[PDB]
Amino acid sequence: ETGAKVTVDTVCKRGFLIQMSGHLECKCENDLVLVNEETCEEKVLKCDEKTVNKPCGDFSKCIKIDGNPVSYACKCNLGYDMVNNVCIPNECKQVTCGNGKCILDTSNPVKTGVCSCNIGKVPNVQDQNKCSKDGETKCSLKCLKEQETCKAVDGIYKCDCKDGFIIICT
Amino acid sequence: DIQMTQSPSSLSASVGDRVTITCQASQDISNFLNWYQQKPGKAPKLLIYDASNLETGVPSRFSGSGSGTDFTFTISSLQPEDIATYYCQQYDNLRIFTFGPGTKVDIKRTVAAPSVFIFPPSDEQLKSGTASVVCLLNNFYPREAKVQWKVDNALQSGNSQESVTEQDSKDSTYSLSSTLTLSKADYEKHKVYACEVTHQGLSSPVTKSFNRGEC
Amino acid sequence: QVQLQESGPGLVKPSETLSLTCTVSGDSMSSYYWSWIRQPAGKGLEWIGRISTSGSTNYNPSLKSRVTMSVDTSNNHFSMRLNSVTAADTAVYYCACSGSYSFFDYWGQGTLVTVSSASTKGPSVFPLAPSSKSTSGGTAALGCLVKDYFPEPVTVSWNSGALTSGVHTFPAVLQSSGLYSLSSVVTVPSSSLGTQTYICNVNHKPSNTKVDKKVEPKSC
């Protein structure tokens, strides 16, 4: 995390908690975008004078660029940089994790990127701490909604329908 | 329907007047309220967005204020080209766009007499058995006007229709077109065709006429 | 920045599906939220629904069960379909867009949709000839009579748009025949009547009728 550590008690506004091998984070409902680590909002689709400072993506806003004539661009929030057209923590610029993603280490006072892996993998000290070693992760999510439990979906833990339910879970 | 209000529903003001329009959203929408100007026969044009931001290129005499539920729109000095219906538009937490009922602003101006013109039916139309005679009242104020058709000095009734343009965006006047419709047979039976115009700007009624076959 | 242009069928029969298309020129369509908004004659504006090229849809709950929308970026088309139309669906339909999700800063010109069982009928165009009974103090008036068409609208330009000052195109009147009739006039200096040619360009899109009519002055 770049801010406070996300926990099982964190409320994701217009979002929901997900778990990987080394952290929790908020994922947005439908097509919303993160304006911070705990808040999702609608995004604008074009950056100009009318949409300045509006969210244009995960951890990005339309920012006034002080160029030859003034222009506007979707620019990552403080602490983030564009890598493959998505905003990731600056200290993750050069970090490659494979079956996972880079996060800031909330246990380190020096800002440092570490790999947090898909459910199934763990940091491999033999392989530059990338997500190449197979390993188990205990799910921390409570999943108190109707007929819901922590399930692994596409490499991440999320609360989902129990055995025999689809769409609230019926 | 979700209920929004705009006040007044219409108004008539002089050029140079300060015009203030109010809008009340259906709920607290913070600053998600926009103002549009719809000139007659045209698409709405965004003037104010996010309650108080002036659209690029919009004259500085337009402004908006407010937050939450109660909003105002102000034209600091009404200009002739500003005649239009103005709509506020909210965006709520269900992502629904709702337009207010709208405020029509008209312009008061000095009385202006109509220019009166009469048009005989064309030879092309006469080939088809129908004769349309048209009387034009050009650039007058106020909107109220009386047109009477006389055929050989006999007052006509039931065989005419008229329509009026919206207020002109330059001189704030109106125009009116009245069509007298007869059969070709009836048209050929009479000589003088006249429309007689009564209007506030005329001291006495004005008649424009022609003789069938004068040309 | 984009330019929007609606196109529609003019007439649509009741209970059938209304199909509209908005042709876009300019910026990439992916930079905008695309919406349809309709307005019955003399009434307010009703937003129908909003979509993006990402596949997101945001239809008005009052019309969600009847309306669908789509974008074809290959042909720069933004379309909507409205099922089971009735007389309540007769209105001017606008396409509109914005980079913002909460307002509309780009609009088309609107296309009038008339729900009706009747067939389209193209208009007859007759000249309104300027004469001495059509002259004031140096000002002459001339025009064109656009008669017996259905449905609305017709558009009238003068000299292919070169003549705009003093033009008055009046609201159509409903005749007892059930067909519309409209006149368009323009005032000019009387000294120009013999030196300039005046042509009204009448377009009735629902019937694909384009008529150019030269308006000749009278000697009397």
Residue numbers in the entry:
A (entry chain I): -2 to 164, 170 to 172
B (entry chain C): 1 to 215
C (entry chain D): 1 to 220
Sentences reproduced from the published study:
One of the most attractive TBV targets is Pfs25, a glycophosphotidylinositol-linked protein expressed on the surface of ookinetes, which develop from the fertilized zygote. Pfs25 is important for ookinete survival in the protease-rich mosquito midgut, and Pfs25 assists in the invasion of the midgut epithelium and maturation of the oocyst. When present in a blood meal, anti-Pfs25 antibodies significantly inhibit the development of oocysts in an in vivo standard membrane feeding assay (SMFA). We determine the co-crystal structures of four human antibodies bound to Pfs25, and describe three novel protective epitopes on Pfs25, including the most potent mAb yet described from any organism.
Notably, mAb 2530 did not compete clearly with any previously defined site, suggesting mAb 2530 may bind a novel epitope on Pfs25, designated Site 3. 2530 binds almost exclusively to the Pfs25 EGF2 domain, with only few van der Waals interactions to EGF1, helping to explain its lack of clear competition with any of the previously defined mAbs. This places the 2530 epitope (Site 3) on Pfs25 nearly opposite to those of 2586 and 2587. Notably, the Site 3-directed mAb 2530 interacts with Pfs25 in a nearly identical manner as 2A8, the canonical mAb to the P25 homolog in Plasmodium vivax. A study in wild-type mice had suggested that this epitope was particularly immunogenic, yet 2530 has one of the least clonally expanded lineages of inhibitory Pfs25 antibodies and is the only Pfs25-directed mAb yet observed to this epitope.
